[PDB]
Write a protein that binds this ligand. Structure first.
Ligand SMILES: CCC(=O)SCCNC(=O)CCNC(=O)[C@H](O)C(C)(C)COP(=O)(O)OP(=O)(O)OC[C@H]1O[C@@H](n2cnc3c(N)ncnc32)[C@H](O)[C@@H]1OP(=O)(O)O
Ligand SMILES: [Zn+2]
Ligand SMILES: [Zn+2]
Ligand SMILES: [Zn+2]
Ligand SMILES: [Zn+2]
Length: 554
């Protein structure tokens, strides 16, 4: 429908093209079509297969060859990427090109918006991290060269040439090095567009938050809606409409009561939902099993319930998932040493909560509420491993904002201490100790007496210890505990004689089958496979919207 008259486009866009022209000397290399031979560069057309330059663009613009403005934008970016492709990162033309692109970014955005568009930005997704089958946690860097096979087996340029000979082994089968692709990790997927069904304008799907399941009749831009005074049909796939639980309700009431007491300007309501609950078992690993299970001194496995929960806030009218946590709950039927214990598997956040100055407070309220809740059920003890994610890894949310800092261990330890200190002052937590002091207090003598949690530090270090010492589970146990003690919190919810005569633990909430949220892996995998990043407010809002559709539909 919306037809851009060629003069309309010329008038609107030509100022953006002049802005590039007016850059001396940066513009000069780009003002005329590259003559490879004159410019003393023969292989140019071996690399650059779709040449483009300012003059060619000016001409297409003057002569009405563009039907819509994104075609102009695409050519501009083709010109830039041609130059970034052919020239070295350190070269003259490269840096000139970079300067032009910055001028362009700033020029083009408000013009595109004048023309009825979401924005005028060129948007691409973050590059995925490439691992290496050659070693355990080797990784391949952005833009550096690497070797791959079937887009499945990749090797860093170092660890690839390490292997003696010309044959690699995958799995087991043998592949000649000549069968690998040599390539640079410089591939970035563009954001997708959706077309207004009325005016025909292409908008970024993430800018307008159009999801085909939620609005199956099709996308209609805000411009077209307002002209006829319409509004979008309600999004029924919201956080609030996910099923309630006793736990979710308890947590969200605690949070919102806290926010109401603070009475900070521009506060929003928080929604907390438990989205997974299932029964699982942790099995004792082979070292510890040989040492204590086979002689009947320790159970071969421990049953627990895992739960996943998330908190959401409305930001700019749209749901935003900002906090996530998975827990392991070992009930009263579980064998010692795990009986009546909870452990936090992992928690994660995306720093867009409003107001900022209450963000940490709100995270604390969620954790204190959770401790209070399980205490009420008759869990006696909480367990926290203060362990920051490894570099550029995510616990729950794929692709954090690059300006969201990740705490080192001392800051994270202090953060948990501040939370627990508030919990103590509220008489929820009786007291808490590091693992070394707690063991001392419990007069612990053997490794079989340490709580054994899925994924936790201690089951792994005990394997290592037994093997290193050639058979002892407990020789350097106190020394290992002392050494790592600042990192391991033991939290006493129910103290002393009362902890010995408790009734059975009965959870009033039902099981909640959701494979997507059975541990952290599935949602990370989904997010990676569907470009659901939490790296900006707009992408997190999109990703939350997609997450909520998945939770509602599956
Ligand atoms: C088994 C694993 C576990 O369950 S424990 C591991 C928990 N999970 C993680 O560490 C995942 C990554 N972290 C997060 O999502 C958040 O850091 C969590 C833990 C939720 C807490 O966030 P928040 O309440 O904002 O505290 P915070 O310390 O992150 O930030 C508050 C202020 O400190 C700053 N900060 C953070 N890191 C650094 C740093 N490395 N160097 C310098 N400053 C840092 C932040 O920028 C922030 O500053 P400000 O308050 O905005 O002024
Ligand atoms: Zn846009
Ligand atoms: Zn490697
Ligand atoms: Zn429209
Ligand atoms: Zn404030």
């Amino acid at each position: 429908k919306k037809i851009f008259k060629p003069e309309e486009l010329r008038q609107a866009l030509m100022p953006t093209l002049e802005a590039l022209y007016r850059q001396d000397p940066e513009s000069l290399p780009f003002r005329q079509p590259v003559d490879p031979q004159l410019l003393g560069i023969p292989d140019y057309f071996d690399i650059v297969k779709s040449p483009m330059d300012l003059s060619t663009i000016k001409r297409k613009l003057d002569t009405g060859q563009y039907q819509e403005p994104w075609q102009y934008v695409d050519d501009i970016w083709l010109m830039f990427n041609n130059a970034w492709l052919y020239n070295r990162k350190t070269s003259r033309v490269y840096k000139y090109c970079s300067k032009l692109s910055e001028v362009f970014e700033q020029e083009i955005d408000p013009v595109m918006q004048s023309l009825g568009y979401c924005c005028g930005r060129k948007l691409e997704f973050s590059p995925q991290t490439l691992c290496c089958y050659g070693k355990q946690l080797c990784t391949i860097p952005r833009d550096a060269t690497y070797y791959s096979y079937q887009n499945r087996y990749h090797f860093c340029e170092k660890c690839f040439n390490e292997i003696q000979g010309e044959s690699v082994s995958l799995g087991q089968t043998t592949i000649n090095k000549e069968q690998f692709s040599k390539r640079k990790n410089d591939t970035l997927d563009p954001e997708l567009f959706v077309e207004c069904t009325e005016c025909g304008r292409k908008m970024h799907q993430i800018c307008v938050l159009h999801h085909e399941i939620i609005w199956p009749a099709g996308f209609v831009c805000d411009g077209c809606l307002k002209k006829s005074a319409r509004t979008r049909k309600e999004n029924k796939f919201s956080a609030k409409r996910l099923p309630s639980t006793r736990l979710g309700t308890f947590l969200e009431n605690r949070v919102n009561d806290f926010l109401r007491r603070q009475n900070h300007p521009e506060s929003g309501e928080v929604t907390v939902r438990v989205v997974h609950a299932s029964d699982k078992t942790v099995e004792v690993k082979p070292g510890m099993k040989a040492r204590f299970v086979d002689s009947g001194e320790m159970a071969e496995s421990f049953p627990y319930r895992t739960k996943a929960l998330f908190a959401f806030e409305e930001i700019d009218g749209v749901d935003l998932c900002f906090f996530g946590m998975h827990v392991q709950e070992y009930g009263s039927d579980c064998p010692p040493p795990n009986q009546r214990r909870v452990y936090i598997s992992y928690l994660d956040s995306v720093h867009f909560f409003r107001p900022k100055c209450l963000r940490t407070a709100v995270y604390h309220e969620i954790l204190i509420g959770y401790l209070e809740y399980v205490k009420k059920l008759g869990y006696t003890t909480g367990h926290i491993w203060a362990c920051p994610p490894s570099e550029g890894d995510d616990y729950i949310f794929h692709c954090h904002p690059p300006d969201q800092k990740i705490p080192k261990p001392k800051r994270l330890q202090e953060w948990f201490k501040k939370m627990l200190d508030k919990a103590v002052s509220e008489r929820i937590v009786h007291d808490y100790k590091d693992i070394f002091k707690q063991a001392t207090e419990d007069r612990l003598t053997s490794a079989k007496e340490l709580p054994y949690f899925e994924g936790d530090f201690w089951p792994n270090v005990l394997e290592e210890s037994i093997k290193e010492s050639g058979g002892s589970g407990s020789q350097k146990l106190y020394a290992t505990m002392e050494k790592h003690k600042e990192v391991f919190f033991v939290i006493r919810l129910i103290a002393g004689p009362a902890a010995n005569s408790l009734p059975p633990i009965v959870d009033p909430d039902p099981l909640i089958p959701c494979d997507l949220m059975d541990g952290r892996d599935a949602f990370l995998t989904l997010a990676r496979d569907k470009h659901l990043e939490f790296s900006s407010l707009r992408r997190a809002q999109w990703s939350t919207m997609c997450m909520l559709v998945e939770l509602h539909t599956q």
